[PDB]
């Protein structure tokens, strides 16, 4: 119900750093109420690499309670930051406008040492 618009066409969602996730949803052929997530992510966070160009995203979405999980590998023709982020969370449709609330993990290397850093991103729709 509350995701009727979300599931039609592409939409742009902007987080606190100004980065933009563009999502498209396609129904799963076998998983009830589930969708494949496609689209692109543009990182606009100052003080990072891989800024200002689209990176494909992919994941999965559950319509029954509007939960999502999606990932980006930070490699494209413009810039390679040799790392990957996974976001998992939920669309909160309870307020005056929708907010996508996520926790993320960033896997990366610092020298020869692997690391996984956690954080949180909240996105609001740009319409």
């Amino acid at each position: 119900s509350p995701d009727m618009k979300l599931l039609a066409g592409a939409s742009n969602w902007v987080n606190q750093s100004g980065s933009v996730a563009q999502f498209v949803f396609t129904p799963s052929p076998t998983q009830p109420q589930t969708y494949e997530v496609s689209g692109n992510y543009i990182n606009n966070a100052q003080g990072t690499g891989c800024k200002g160009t689209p990176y494909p995203l992919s994941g999965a979405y559950y319509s029954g309670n509007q939960i999502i999980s999606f990932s980006v590998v930070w490699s494209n023709a413009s810039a390679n930051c040799q790392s990957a982020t996974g976001w998992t969370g939920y669309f909160d449709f309870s307020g005056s406008q929708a907010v996508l609330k996520t926790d993320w993990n960033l896997a990366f290397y610092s020298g020869s040492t692997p690391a996984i850093q956690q954080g949180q991103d909240d996105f609001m729709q740009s319409v």
Partner: peptide
């Protein structure tokens, strides 16, 4: 000719 950074957080 992609620009390479050590990680997303280290330009």
């Amino acid at each position: 000719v992609a620009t390479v950074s050590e990680s997303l957080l280290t330009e």
